[PDB]
UniProtKB/Swiss-Prot annotation, chain C:
This is Spike protein S2'. The lineage of its organism: Viruses, Riboviria, Orthornavirae, Pisuviricota, Pisoniviricetes. The chain holds residues 975 to 1023 of 1273 of the full protein. Subunit of the fusion protein that is processed upon entry into the host cell. Mediates fusion of the virion and cellular membranes by functioning as a class I viral fusion protein. Contains a viral fusion peptide that is unmasked after S2 cleavage. This cleavage can occur at the cell membrane by host TMPRSS2 or during endocytosis by host CSTL. In either case, this triggers an extensive and irreversible conformational change that leads to fusion of the viral envelope with the cellular cytoplasmic membrane, releasing viral genomic RNA into the host cell cytoplasm. It comes from Severe acute respiratory syndrome coronavirus 2.
Amino acid sequence: CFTNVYADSFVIRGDEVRQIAPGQTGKIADYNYKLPDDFTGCVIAWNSN
Amino acid sequence: FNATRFASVYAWNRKRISNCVADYSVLYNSASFSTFKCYGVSPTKLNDL
Amino acid sequence: SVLNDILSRLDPPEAEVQIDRLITGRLQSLQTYVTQQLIRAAEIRASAN
């Protein structure tokens, strides 16, 4: 059971998959989308090639 | 970094760099797709020492 | 074995695993010293009596 759930959706190319990880920072990620070190939850990429 | 020919694996070319100022911001920015994963040190601007 | 060198060379999420083992070693040293001091104090108290 959880207090609340937040869902975030955006398109990211497969070359950019490695940089979008919890705690693994990247320049393009650091200026667009940063994840906290203690992030709890799941990150899923859905096939849209 | 920007050269013409690179040596083979079995005979690898070693270069010595000393007595200058090494700005590590250009390497990180240009050709960002190039892998830049570091051991022992953090490339996240903590390379200025 | 220098705290500042660890802090001035690594980003936090990988510096933590180094700080932790330094902390464990130093805590062990302090605990051993305190135990020996307690035993020595007991002997000195017997002599004073």
